Design an enzyme around this catalytic site. Structure first.
Site, PDB file in Angstrom:
ATOM      1  N   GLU A 289      24.115 -47.634 105.397  1.00 46.73           N
ATOM      2  CA  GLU A 289      23.037 -46.654 105.284  1.00 46.73           C
ATOM      3  C   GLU A 289      21.988 -47.041 104.236  1.00 46.73           C
ATOM      4  O   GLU A 289      20.825 -46.690 104.379  1.00 46.73           O
ATOM      5  CB  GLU A 289      23.599 -45.259 105.006  1.00 46.73           C
ATOM      6  CG  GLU A 289      24.389 -44.667 106.170  1.00 46.73           C
ATOM      7  CD  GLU A 289      25.873 -45.034 106.179  1.00 46.73           C
ATOM      8  OE1 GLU A 289      26.299 -45.960 105.436  1.00 46.73           O
ATOM      9  OE2 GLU A 289      26.626 -44.397 106.946  1.00 46.73           O
TER      10      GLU A 289
ATOM     11  N   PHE B  46      20.415 -53.941  93.612  1.00 47.82           N
ATOM     12  CA  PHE B  46      20.676 -55.217  94.277  1.00 47.82           C
ATOM     13  C   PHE B  46      20.980 -54.958  95.768  1.00 47.82           C
ATOM     14  O   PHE B  46      21.365 -53.851  96.141  1.00 47.82           O
ATOM     15  CB  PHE B  46      21.687 -56.097  93.508  1.00 47.82           C
ATOM     16  CG  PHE B  46      23.144 -55.657  93.547  1.00 47.82           C
ATOM     17  CD1 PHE B  46      23.567 -54.450  94.091  1.00 47.82           C
ATOM     18  CD2 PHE B  46      24.107 -56.503  92.998  1.00 47.82           C
ATOM     19  CE1 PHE B  46      24.923 -54.098  94.096  1.00 47.82           C
ATOM     20  CE2 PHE B  46      25.468 -56.150  92.990  1.00 47.82           C
ATOM     21  CZ  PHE B  46      25.873 -54.947  93.552  1.00 47.82           C
TER      22      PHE B  46
ATOM     23  N   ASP C  44      22.749 -64.873  94.845  1.00 49.92           N
ATOM     24  CA  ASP C  44      24.053 -64.685  95.485  1.00 49.92           C
ATOM     25  C   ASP C  44      24.681 -63.302  95.225  1.00 49.92           C
ATOM     26  O   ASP C  44      25.255 -62.704  96.125  1.00 49.92           O
ATOM     27  CB  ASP C  44      25.025 -65.789  95.075  1.00 49.92           C
ATOM     28  CG  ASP C  44      25.233 -65.857  93.584  1.00 49.92           C
ATOM     29  OD1 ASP C  44      24.241 -66.130  92.859  1.00 49.92           O
ATOM     30  OD2 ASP C  44      26.352 -65.635  93.058  1.00 49.92           O
TER      31      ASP C  44
ATOM     32  N   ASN D  81      24.077 -69.301  92.120  1.00 50.40           N
ATOM     33  CA  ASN D  81      24.709 -69.872  90.932  1.00 50.40           C
ATOM     34  C   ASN D  81      26.112 -69.336  90.684  1.00 50.40           C
ATOM     35  O   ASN D  81      26.635 -69.446  89.576  1.00 50.40           O
ATOM     36  CB  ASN D  81      23.797 -69.682  89.699  1.00 50.40           C
ATOM     37  CG  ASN D  81      23.833 -68.275  89.122  1.00 50.40           C
ATOM     38  OD1 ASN D  81      23.897 -67.267  89.845  1.00 50.40           O
ATOM     39  ND2 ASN D  81      23.780 -68.204  87.798  1.00 50.40           N
TER      40      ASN D  81
ATOM     41  N   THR E  97      27.144 -66.401  90.276  1.00 51.72           N
ATOM     42  CA  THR E  97      27.114 -65.514  89.115  1.00 51.72           C
ATOM     43  C   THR E  97      26.146 -64.360  89.282  1.00 51.72           C
ATOM     44  O   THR E  97      25.101 -64.508  89.921  1.00 51.72           O
ATOM     45  CB  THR E  97      26.681 -66.324  87.854  1.00 51.72           C
ATOM     46  OG1 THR E  97      27.423 -67.547  87.762  1.00 51.72           O
ATOM     47  CG2 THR E  97      27.022 -65.597  86.590  1.00 51.72           C
TER      48      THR E  97
ATOM     49  N   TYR F  44      20.312 -71.689  85.667  1.00 54.38           N
ATOM     50  CA  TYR F  44      19.297 -71.061  84.838  1.00 54.38           C
ATOM     51  C   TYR F  44      19.175 -71.670  83.450  1.00 54.38           C
ATOM     52  O   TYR F  44      18.054 -71.895  82.979  1.00 54.38           O
ATOM     53  CB  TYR F  44      19.578 -69.554  84.703  1.00 54.38           C
ATOM     54  CG  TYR F  44      19.405 -68.824  85.998  1.00 54.38           C
ATOM     55  CD1 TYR F  44      18.162 -68.780  86.620  1.00 54.38           C
ATOM     56  CD2 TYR F  44      20.482 -68.203  86.616  1.00 54.38           C
ATOM     57  CE1 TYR F  44      17.985 -68.114  87.810  1.00 54.38           C
ATOM     58  CE2 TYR F  44      20.324 -67.539  87.835  1.00 54.38           C
ATOM     59  CZ  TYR F  44      19.068 -67.499  88.426  1.00 54.38           C
ATOM     60  OH  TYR F  44      18.895 -66.849  89.622  1.00 54.38           O
TER      61      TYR F  44
END
Ligand SMILES: Cc1ncc(C[n+]2csc(CCOP(=O)(O)OP(=O)(O)O)c2C)c(N)n1
Ligand SMILES: Cc1ncc(C[n+]2csc(CCOP(=O)(O)OP(=O)(O)O)c2C)c(N)n1
Ligand SMILES: Cc1ncc(C[n+]2csc(CCOP(=O)(O)OP(=O)(O)O)c2C)c(N)n1
Ligand SMILES: [Mg+2]
Ligand SMILES: [Mg+2]
Ligand SMILES: [Mg+2]
Lengths: 559, 558, 547
Positions: free
Chosen positions: B46, B424, B449, B476, B478, B547
């Site tokens: 949803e 996210f 990811d 990465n 992470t 990074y």
């Protein structure tokens, strides 16, 4: 040494060893290494974290804990919180919040009114204001979580206060977690229980309908001993399966409103028609065994036993209402019926034969397998792999779930695990994670439909990472099949844009996540894949194509 | 002809042609074929449905709709509702509820108190009680949704009432506002003239432009104002593209993370000489905060917003102009018609530092760097898009702030991300909505990811709808943003809170029916992007990155 | 120098000179002498405090303030808050709370969850957490209070924080008139309303109080005079035209056909073909059903809010903008229109006048129409032109005030149209007299309502506010007896009947001089004595209604 330390330390005081969650920028204030003996369990989604905690709390009987960040963190967690409030489990849900001086809901970046959002679906909801009080907030959260109906308690944690040491010093008071759930007890329940006993004395064909609250009370051995002495059949809700062993002559099975339609059989009538006394022991409407389901055949008297006052008099008005702890009820009832002899139990062999017939279905179908054939295969392998009275079959939500209710082997309490109150799709993976952590050396099988499994499939990676040896069977018909059923019940036709998917290769999906997998399309292949997964020492996933072929007209009991 | 028909029909009257969602057992009361012109768009979760509605509403400037079942459907939808309330979009959010006579929240199977849960995060929240009133509830929902600050309105729909024809006879004009209704203070014109007087005295003013300026329809008018008086334009994350790429007054977007990422005094360069900041269409939720522009000399400020200032504790502008943004700009034009052009200040050292990151020719032993990924994305986006077209979408994470700095935006909302809510998993639904809103433009998504995998199952939805989105997943292993914050707070990491095992996103995409490939350097990535852009089908590219962050340069985040 | 100082000081910056209320144990943290130019006005009940502030805010058009202690202080205040939110007034309501560290609602002594209780009946509601933020909390309260629909903002003040100086070492910009909403394209909608008006033979302007807050009375009057458009008002907007003005078609109420034994409403609205509701607000209780008489009408809604009630009111043309701004654009669009023939209501007017002049002497008591006639006569004598206030409490008699009470200025007749709490009278008269210190202020109340809140007679005497009160007494909650008869066709006395209260002796017990009046002659003399007394005065009149 901050509120973060005092928080984790107080959780540890209440026996918590794991915190399930996803951490956000509040990681600046809390690392999760501050306290020995409590570890963070990272998930892919906050729902998974909340449901894992719910299920670990259900199997252990102890409070558990989950975690999310502010704003959308908390709202994602909230479906896990909703699972706990409706399925009944003592969960401490923790979420970060904006810095205390910067809390402007719907204006500050990522800032929502967390307490206001979560209060209607929790036992207790509060925002931290003075760092040292986190100790007493955790305690009050546990107190309210561990009071029936058991449920989640929520604490919102402004990031500045979480990272502050203000007012925090060096020896906590005793935790005093309730040994089992606190309940309410009406004056005169003993008299009400004696009236229940007097109804039993007159009754020809009584039954015990057992819900999960009976299990939380620690009443399973006592209920079994009572049933065996008096020859009273035990019928259950979905998760009360296994309160008697598979094969026990008083194990009359579980009820679902879907059972007549799935079996094309008068199963409710067979189960209840000749019954004249229904004792709903630890009754809870949320579990969805409703009065209309037992109101079959002759007129019945009812006895409600629960550690709560009746919240639903509009729907259930028992002849006798015994508000007390379930175990205390049974012990009082044993004394009051000590002199009673055993009843003649009513005959449900025709229903048993129908259930056995579905499980033994030898046909090959041109489409995929049938779900009953899948569950029979899972039952066989679970029986091989588990010690007697051990093992867990977990079910996500869907039409297939109600086949699970009818057909799945349960050889101990919570031996068949699903979400009865809340029933969020995607429940399967977090429930299997919790079940396997709760029972580290027992086989854990999960069955899930394509719709629900894919709603939360990303936590396959979490299963891989924690190396939890769960075996998952995905029954795939490229449909939210339960919803196609309801389209047809209501309108006598489908509409595919609302229920149909394209193809997902779950074998390949699993393998992308580091979980070995395989496809099975008949009994022989399924038994082999299940036996391999069970012995693998690793997670394993099996995709099985299925179809249903349902009768939309056979489901009138659903209204 | 039931309340389901009256509901869908009324959404149709307000211009709605799609309802995004997941349907539950309320399917017994609603099929979604009752009204021609309205199609159901099925998602895997949803959240995706709410976010796609949010983004479609943002780009079209029209009310859009999403749908969930009772209980956990509603709570799942609620993260999409939170996206719309904080990011400001007019979404009509609809969810089933238990049968009216059976509503016992937390006791009845799947029954939660939906209105009480949603009210705090919405403009309007109500439960249907009498079927025929659904028409007027939808009207009240649109009304509240299209009043600044724009946001979602919620209607809870008991299954029995949704399926009932009681009181429904076989419609008044919809009167859908063409742009958001605004708040207007008496004396705003006088406040606007005080703003003009501050502009007259200022030597180095800037316009800091937020998304509310876009909603108001004020983009061309701000551009003409700025060009006439030579005033630089600085944006929030999603107001990127109010000027074209290359425009000399395009001074870039701000993010709190920019000094740390660039390892450069970027905010100081942007703001130190400035003596007057005009925040046009200001909204704190966008996270361009006063502390970010309070660098160097003391500045005067002018707030322009179609809302009363909700945050006087943080922002006390010298002049507060509460009115419609376009109305402000047209009055301000008149008041400043005779002013001489300004001498705008220099940010070339910052421009050069950004260009240098974009042109980074190093090969790392790790994987790629995110600024190289976005450079490759910009290059291919420019080749595939018509001028003034194209959308780059960003999910949430550390890489997202590289998007803010580095991603190409050649039109308003040419770079889309969630500024207010920042959940996210935003990427896929936002790319879906963006692609449906601009069916003939290239739509690229970048996601990390962590976030990508939080909502990766709706890859199947992209395939089923055949939306030619090109996705780059920078991986990465992470939650990197979060490891960074561990290091800011504690000067070390703790892996169990941030680290994952390996996921093969290429194989994941292919399991959902989306072609995909791995790319580990610029050459491979440029080729994968060009292949994806001309494919006429969705495509996914996984790129290993790292990074290597410097926690000491992120003081502006406090 | 504590948060108490900073709170009072910021109220002062927003122009507040009085805080009405009842102080509790928070007096330990706030005295009310910390800031020069702010006085505390002590009432006998918190309700009186809230309503007085509501009325003072209405008349002055500036934010006002009220105060209560924690727990039941706050709940008593909440009826005043409810008054402010439904009647529409910018009121800052302040209540103490338990010490911050001891806030446990429903467990701590006198602790209620104040914010949760008051949030649904306010524009804004918050609890102080950091002492120095009280300044910004007051600003946000004022901001929300002065946005249409104007209303109360609530701040809860834990006593430890109120008395703390931690963190305590900017211009107020108080809005001069309410902030409102404006829809894009409202000018075009206003032009559609102009085109409806060109086609209409018998338009009317129904004016609500939001039009007064916008500063649009002179402009509406000039518009109405030029195009010969009758003006009808709500309860609260009586006086937007002078008494006697030919276009002053009066206020309406639902009981007016019954009171006059006359088809008054049909006479007023039947031939009307266009109704422009200027500053419309459903809460003022002039509903669409009241103008839906005779022929089908086109409607124009004008309001600085988006329509909250499309189920009940769907205007043909909806103009969402500031009322004054609408009127100035409408002037331009209708500059060259010919004036209308206005519809004839002279039979209604002559009836009303016959009613007010009723010379009969009744055996029982006086009739309320005779009481208001008398009050009108003496008010016109004692007041300068365009001045004076008649205040009405709630009950059956209140409808007589709406229909017949003289109002020679905006807010010249006061009552509670939105909330309609009994007991509103005394506080509304206090607020009105303080707002207009040199103007005569009369109150009419029924025995039921007046006694619900009569103890604040002592406040009137303590403040020496020269209010003249008339209590019409029938030993009954009369309106409620009327409702019993409408629904069941009989009375049930235990739910509506009182024994005797001697309101003369009651007033005098409170230090207010009083007298009984049983006919026109005695009432006129009593009113003239009270008006010239330079002190409060109360007059009890026996009445009967007989349905
Ligand atoms: C969060 C949530 N949204 C929607 C639903 C409605 N629903 C219940 S189960 C389910 C999935 C049904 O599909 P599937 O998992 O494939 O099982 P099937 O019915 O096909 O046997 C859906 C959409 C739900 N239960 N939970
Ligand atoms: C719903 C939700 N939960 C938690 C967070 C905290 N958070 C923000 S972005 C993000 C993802 C970070 O990882 P990734 O997408 O891989 O980007 P990276 O930082 O590694 O560049 C997380 C966990 C969030 N933003 N939203
Ligand atoms: C707080 C409150 N409670 C109850 C009511 C119902 N009510 C309205 S006016 C009123 C008083 C009626 O009696 P009275 O003031 O003597 O005037 P009458 O109707 O007799 O003319 C009552 C009880 C009310 N208005 N307000
Ligand atoms: Mg399926
Ligand atoms: Mg990452
Ligand atoms: Mg009376």
């Amino acid at each position: 040494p901050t509120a973060a330390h005092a928080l984790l330390s107080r959780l540890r005081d209440h026996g918590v060893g794991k915190v399930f969650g996803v951490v956000g920028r509040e990681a600046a204030s809390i690392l999760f290494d501050e306290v020995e003996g409590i570890d963070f369990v990272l998930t892919r989604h906050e729902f998974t974290a909340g449901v894992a905690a719910d299920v670990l709390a259900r199997i252990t009987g102890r409070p558990q804990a989950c975690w999310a960040t502010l704003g959308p963190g908390m709202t994602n967690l909230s479906t896990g919180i909703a699972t706990s409030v409706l399925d009944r489990s003592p969960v401490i849900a923790l979420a970060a919040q904006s810095e205390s001086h910067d809390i402007f809901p719907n204006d500050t970046h990522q800032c929502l009114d967390s307490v206001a959002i979560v209060a209607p679906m929790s036992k207790y909801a509060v925002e931290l204001q003075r760092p040292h009080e986190i100790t007493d907030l955790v305690d009050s959260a546990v107190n309210a979580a561990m009071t029936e109906p058991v449920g989640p308690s929520f604490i919102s944690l402004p990031v500045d206060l979480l990272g502050s040491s203000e007012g925090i010093d060096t020896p906590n008071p005793p935790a005093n977690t309730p040994a089992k759930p606190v309940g309410v007890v009406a004056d005169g329940w003993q008299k009400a229980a004696d009236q229940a006993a007097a109804l039993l004395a007159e009754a020809k064909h009584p039954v015990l309908v057992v819900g999960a609250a009976a299990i939380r009370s620690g009443a399973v051995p006592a209920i079994r001993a009572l049933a065996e002495r008096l020859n009273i059949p035990v019928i259950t809700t979905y998760i009360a399966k296994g309160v008697l062993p598979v094969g026990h002559e008083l194990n009359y099975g579980a009820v679902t409103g879907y059972m007549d339609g799935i079996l094309n059989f008068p199963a409710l009538q067979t189960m209840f028609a000749p019954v004249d006394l229904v004792l709903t022991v630890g009754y809870d409407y949320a579990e969805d065994l409703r009065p209309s389901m037992w109101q079959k055949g002759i007129e019945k008297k009812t006895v409600r036993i629960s550690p709560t006052v009746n919240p639903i008099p509009r729907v259930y008005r028992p002849d006798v209402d015994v508000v007390t702890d379930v175990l205390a009820f049974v012990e009082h009832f044993e004394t009051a019926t000590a002199s009673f002899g055993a009843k003649q139990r009513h005959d449900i062999e025709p229903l048993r034969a129908r259930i056995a017939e579905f499980l033994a279905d030898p046909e090959t179908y041109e489409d995929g397998m049938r779900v009953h054939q899948v569950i029979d295969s899972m039952n066989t392998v679970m029986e091989e792999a588990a010690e007697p009275g051990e093992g867990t079959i977990v079910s996500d939500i869907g039409f297939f779930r109600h086949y699970g209710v009818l057909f799945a082997r349960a050889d101990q309490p919570f031996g068949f695990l699903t979400s009865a109150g809340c029933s969020s799709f995607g429940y399967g993976i977090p429930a299997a994670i919790g079940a396997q952590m709760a029972r580290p050396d027992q086989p854990t099988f999960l069955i899930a439909g394509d719709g629900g499994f894919h709603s939360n499939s990303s936590d396959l990676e979490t299963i891989a990472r924690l190396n939890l040896p769960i075996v998952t069977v995905v029954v795939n018909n490229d449909t939210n099949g339960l919803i196609e059923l309801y389209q047809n019940i209501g309108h006598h036709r489908s509409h595919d844009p609302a229920v149909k998917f394209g193809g997902v290769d779950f074998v390949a999906l699993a393998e992308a996540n580091g979980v070995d997998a395989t496809r099975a399309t008949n009994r022989e292949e399924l038994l082999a894949a299940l036996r391999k997964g069970a012995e693998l020492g690793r997670p394993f996933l099996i995709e099985v194509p299925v179809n249903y072929d349902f009768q939309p007209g056979g489901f009138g009991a659903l209204s």
